[PDB]
């Protein structure tokens, strides 16, 4: 029917969620090695917080196929970090250290510009 | 026809000049403001009006293929000269 | 000019030692050639 579609890897959320945890464990265990090889100025705890935050923003997904892609992309990101294909600049682009915070309240937006 | 503003900055042929309180004048400190000295509006006024003996004259700017597209100018109106739309040259009809 | 030299070395300019109030005895620049001679010096024409 219309709702019948090929799976990427997972046939339902339960199988997809397994791959999410397997990815989280791989990421969780590479922050100390990443913070060491790249000689980052951040701590391991805040490096693991960023991993947690990335896994949290897209936590409302219910389509098994979308989850597979998010894990496929997540593994590609992990492979680049482990292989040291990335450099110190690429690892630190998750932290946005150079752009001032954009205020989220209505009044603060109203003073600075026309954007909502 | 370069005029100078009260502060001293040259006015360009487009009429551009920074006001007195404009901070952008700081780019010319230690440097200069490049202003072309030959104002086109003034040089095309110096050209004499051409007296032709027909109602319609054609201008191609001079030089044949090196000029501008050839256009025909109507000279029936005796209260003004017929100006070429591309090059500004003026024409008049002899005693009519 | 020396037309017995091979193409490229058959024309050259010895720059002035003073141009527009600047001492160019040792400091010479390729942009000091005026446009009329620029054409002849770069072989865009045969007529100086």
């Amino acid at each position: 029917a219309s709702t019948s579609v090929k799976p990427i890897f997972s046939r339902d959320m339960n199988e997809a969620k397994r791959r999410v945890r397997e990815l989280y464990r791989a990421w969780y265990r590479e922050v100390p090695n990443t913070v060491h090889l790249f000689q980052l100025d951040i701590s391991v705890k805040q490096g693991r917080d960023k991993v947690r935050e990335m896994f949290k923003k897209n936590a409302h997904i219910t389509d098994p196929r979308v989850v597979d892609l998010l894990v496929i992309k997540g593994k590609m990101e992990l492979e680049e970090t482990i292989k040291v294909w990335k450099q110190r600049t690429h690892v630190m682009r998750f932290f946005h250290e150079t752009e001032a915070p954009r205020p989220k309240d209505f009044l603060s937006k109203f003073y600075v510009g026309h954007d909502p | 026809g370069v005029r100078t503003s009260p502060t001293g900055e040259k006015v360009t042929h487009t009429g551009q000049v920074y006001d007195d309180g404009d901070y952008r004048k700081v780019r010319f400190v230690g440097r200069q403001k490049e202003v072309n000295e030959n104002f086109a509006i003034d040089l095309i006024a110096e050209q004499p009006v051409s007296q032709v003996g027909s109602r319609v004259i054609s201008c191609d700017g001079g030089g044949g293929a090196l000029g501008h597209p050839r256009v025909y100018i109507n000279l029936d109106k005796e209260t003004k000269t017929g100006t070429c739309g591309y090059c500004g040259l003026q024409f008049r009809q002899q005693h009519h | 000019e020396d037309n017995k030299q091979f193409f490229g070395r058959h024309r050259w300019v010895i720059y002035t030692t003073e141009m527009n109030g600047k001492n160019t005895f040792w400091d010479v620049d390729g942009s000091m050639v005026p446009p009329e001679w620029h054409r002849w010096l770069h072989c865009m024409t045969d007529d100086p």
Binding site: - | T12, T14, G15, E34, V35, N36, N38, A40, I41, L43, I44, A45, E46, Q47, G61, G62, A65, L66, G67, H68, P69, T83, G85, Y86, C87, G88, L89 | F6, F7, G8, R9, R11, W12, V13, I14, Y15, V28, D29, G30, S31, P35, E36, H38, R39, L41, H42, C43, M44, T45
Partner: protein
């Protein structure tokens, strides 16, 4: 049709095998290479004495953009924006209005010479030979802002290079 580059069988007769033995032991073919570079030592070098000598160019050479005038001093540009619409690098910015005497002229004509790809399409598209690429190729600057030309810089180039632009156009206008 085709040919084989490396499909020859070396002779095995005793003379040929000894000719190859002499080449290996006595380095004969390595000594031809020495002869070919000793030849070049006694050839006149191809170097020219820049900046006193210049590399040859042609009237079509595409160099620094410039804005031209009619023989009367009037600008040739009538703010049509065909050059702006064809610039592949979108390096031309034009604004226009009715001049004080009613003429159709630009109030802005900028070329970002760091966006320009020096392709000459603008001078192809101009119906009045206003914007051209002159013969100049020595205008390197020490700051990025000196390469953002406005209408004054381009008009100054035209007055500065008209004597040479006009003769280059006269030499090549019959091919275009």
């Amino acid at each position: 049709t085709y040919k084989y580059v490396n499909l020859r069988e070396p002779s095995m007769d005793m003379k040929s095998v000894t000719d190859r033995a002499a080449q290996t032991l006595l380095w004969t073919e390595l000594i031809r290479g020495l002869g070919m570079t000793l030849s070049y030592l006694f050839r006149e070098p191809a170097t020219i004495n820049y900046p006193f000598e210049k590399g040859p160019l042609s009237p079509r050479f595409r160099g620094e953009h410039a804005l031209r005038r009619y023989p009367s001093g009037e600008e040739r540009c009538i703010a049509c924006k065909l050059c702006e619409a064809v610039c592949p690098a979108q390096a031309i910015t034009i604004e226009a209005e009715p001049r004080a005497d009613g003429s159709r002229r630009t109030t802005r004509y900028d070329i970002d010479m760091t966006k320009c790809i020096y392709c000459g399409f603008c001078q192809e598209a101009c119906p009045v030979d206003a914007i051209v690429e002159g013969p100049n190729f020595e205008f390197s600057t020490e700051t990025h802002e000196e390469l953002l030309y406005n209408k004054e810089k381009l008009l100054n180039n035209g007055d500065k290079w008209e004597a040479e632009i006009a003769a280059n156009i006269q030499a090549d206008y019959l091919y275009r």
